[PDB]
């Protein structure tokens, strides 16, 4: 398809089937980096992402849109034809739904034995009858992986937000697909990847869970965003807003204690000279430290705290609100937030390409396409006649431009 | 170096410089999938991850350990010699710290012009003087990206946990390096990747922020893990634990309203017939729906709720605590949590390899290596004699096995 040549992934042919976040996020990341990415939508109903008023302009940019029933008759024939020249196929569905509907990996590899297939699901491509065919939900994936119980406040768990599991899972699919692609180039043989959302999130929540698995205890939840174990680490309230800080180091602790009214605790058997970290539960003065730190911070503006913490080399940062990002010096210098044109000629604002490739940078070349916008061109390219396409449309197996 | 041949990344030579999570997570992910990955540690002090009692056995498995001062004299020579046969180099540092110490991308490409270089920093390789040279911290990246301000409770922001920003950033680096690797196959030219942690997290926080950027409003924070906008979606407390649910669909809403005592609202102007989703802010009875739902769920055990929600086709799941994972049928069936031997010959439990590659699965072949364990072998492999190595050790430029 027509598009500029750019990025590390120029010339790569990616196709994805799925809606909302996880699957499409995986597929569209390839597009940020130069790939030719075809977004498959059902004929009767478009991707449900489209009901979101603004986000899709970001999450569907740089894409080509195909509307095809890939499971039925001529629509299935066309899909499998497309696979013959596709490098990577990404799909998000309810477990092994593709195989159940007749498109096994075997059938896919009949049409392209080099194909990299990435299956994104809530509970995996195989397992028990109870879980395997269940739908993928971000909150369910966090619930099932032990991620949800470790997020939130001491006595109130909460999911990570927004849709954190969908992004981790989609990103993993991208990563794994690029790894499999390397193997294809070395080897001439394709791959099937079973990305289960709960296994992705299981990995991401292991920092303390590894203690539980290995004779220790699981950590408690944070208290109001404070570190579960170490005093003076995490989220704090200043007079002026919120700050995050890391009270770490001999001098840092000595001088901070003096600031906050706790100089008398230095050189104590509980806080011996050379103390680098205050363990809030192991140290009897843990809670007292938090009391004095809260009180001192509540008295000072973020600008004041930042000035003092800079003298002491205590790492810290103001918690920025959404309205503060665009005008931030780093954001400005790096063009971290930019603008582009939608396909219907409106100005849209949002994050630039990330990350920044030096030699072959990504670019935004296309706004989000409309439902079935590129169907006619795609089907032509893979050998369908004008009549073939008309028949597909009239049968409800394809949709062309609005 | 000695290791089994397996995974999609068999034969690939990866080296990483960094400590703790972000950089090492990026590098080690290659090792999960079959790559030869060399973990660089300093000479006088080891990676600080090693102070963690259990996690490092997971986060450093399948790795080779090199202890070398890569910035000084003969240590720099040995490092740059290693680069000559290295496919990917991942480094996590304070902005352009490598360049400032004389190891620029240009110098790296002088030794290997094909080299893929991934730079992981908090704020980027370039920008302003105030931000560019700051240290990377998970909480700071969340604070600076607008991720922290949207997580937590209505009146209490909280960071995603644990170290969520480090994992996203690390994973992104793996993804981007693999993409750059693909391009090297065509051009024979390497690449430099500028991964700034805040830009990674900016992207992950866009779902609602895209409204703010484009004439709408930023979403509110969740209340006790409940959807910011839609009633009956998100986290709820039952009699004997927590569940997540999605109140979506005509019959689902109708029958749930009846269960909870709100039958009289069905067919009103506020909740017309055929309503599929309750917008909690736009619907005058949104808060009322929550009250009644909270009340009904509080009365019932999770077993009872799931039974009822199965009847009604309302998607839901128990929020599992960490002790409930190992014996779960899906975990059991998929071997999601497995066991392996540490190099001290102890049994270690933790997550299996993810995701599951069908043709070329990853495997655990090695426990976490000790400080400088493979220094001698690595240096011998790149042409150093026993005497060359001994001189490096005496000069404090390298450490060999314990």
Curated annotation (Swiss-Prot), chains A, B:
Q: What protein is this chain from?
A: L-carnitine CoA-transferase
What function is annotated for this protein? Catalyzes the reversible transfer of the CoA moiety from gamma-butyrobetainyl-CoA to L-carnitine to generate L-carnitinyl-CoA and gamma-butyrobetaine. Is also able to catalyze the reversible transfer of the CoA moiety from gamma-butyrobetainyl-CoA or L-carnitinyl-CoA to crotonobetaine to generate crotonobetainyl-CoA.
Q: What else is known?
A: Some strains of E.coli, such as ATCC 25922, can metabolize carnitine under aerobiosis.
Q: Under the cellular component aspect of Gene Ontology, which terms does the record hold?
A: cytoplasm
Q: Where does CoA bind?
A: 94, 101
What Enzyme Commission number does this protein have? Answer: 2.8.3.21
What broad class describes the main subcellular location of this protein?
cytoplasm
Q: Name one GO molecular function term.
A: L-carnitine CoA-transferase activity
**Among its keywords, does the record have Cytoplasm?**
yes
Question: Which pathway does the UniProt entry assign to this protein?
Answer: Amine and polyamine metabolism; carnitine metabolism
What family is it from? Belongs to the CoA-transferase III family. CaiB subfamily.
Q: Where in the cell is it found?
A: Cytoplasm
The record's listing under HAMAP family reads: CaiB
Superkingdom of the organism of origin:
Bacteria
Catalysed reaction equations from the record: crotonobetainyl-CoA + (R)-carnitine = crotonobetaine + (R)-carnitinyl-CoA; 4-(trimethylamino)butanoyl-CoA + (R)-carnitine = (R)-carnitinyl-CoA + 4-(trimethylamino)butanoate
The question of whether Nucleotide-binding is a record keyword is answered with no
Organism this protein belongs to: Escherichia coli (strain K12)
**Quaternary assembly:** Homodimer.
Q: Entry's Pfam families?
A: CoA_transf_3 (PF02515)
């Amino acid at each position: 398809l027509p598009m500029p040549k750019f990025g590390p992934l120029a010339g790569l042919r990616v196709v994805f089937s799925g809606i909302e976040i996880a699957g499409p996020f995986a597929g569209q990341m390839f597009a940020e980096w130069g790939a030719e990415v075809i977004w498959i939508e059902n004929v009767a109903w478009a991707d449900t992402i489209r009901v979101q008023p603004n986000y899709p302009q970001l999450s569907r940019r740089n894409l080509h849109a195909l509307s095809l029933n890939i499971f039925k008759d001529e629509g299935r024939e066309a899909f499998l034809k497309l696979m013959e020249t596709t490098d990577i196929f990404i799909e998000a569905s309810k477990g092994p739904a593709f195989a159940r509907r007749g498109i096994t990996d075997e059938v896919l590899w009949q049409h392209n034995p080099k194909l990299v297939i990435a299956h994104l699901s809530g509970f995996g491509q195989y397992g028990t009858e109870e879980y395997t065919n269940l739908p993928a939900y971000n909150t369910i994936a966090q619930a099932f992986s032990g991620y949800l119980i470790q997020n939130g406040d001491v006595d109130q768990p909460m999911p990570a937000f927004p849709y954190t599991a969908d992004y981790f899972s989609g990103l993993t699919a991208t990563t794994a697909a690029l790894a499999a692609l390397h193997k294809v180039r070395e080897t001439g043989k394709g791959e099937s990847i079973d990305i289960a959302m709960y296994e992705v999130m299981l990995r991401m929540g292991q920092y303390f869970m590894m203690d539980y698995f290995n004779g220790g205890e699981m950590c408690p939840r944070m208290s109001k965003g404070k570190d579960p174990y170490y005093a003076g680490c995490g989220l704090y309230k200043c007079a002026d807003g919120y700050i995050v800080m890391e009270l770490v180091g001999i001098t840092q602790i000595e001088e901070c204690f003096k600031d906050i009214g706790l100089a008398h605790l230095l050189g104590t058997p509980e806080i011996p000279e050379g103390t680098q970290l205050i363990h809030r539960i192991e140290c009897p003065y843990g809670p007292l430290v938090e009391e004095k730190l809260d009180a001192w911070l509540a008295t000072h503006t973020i600008a004041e705290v930042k000035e003092r913490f800079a003298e002491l080399n205590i790492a810290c940062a103001k918690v920025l609100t959404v309205p503060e990002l665009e005008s931030n010096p780093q954001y400005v210098a790096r063009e971290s937030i930019t603008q582009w044109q939608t396909m219907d000629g409106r100005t849209c604002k949002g994050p630039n390409i990330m990350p920044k490739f030096k030699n072959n940078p990504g670019q935004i070349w296309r706004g989000m396409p409309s439902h079935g916008m590129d169907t006619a061109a795609i089907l032509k390219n893979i050998g369908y006649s004008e009549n073939d396409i008309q028949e597909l449309v009239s049968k409800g197996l394809a949709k062309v431009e609005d």
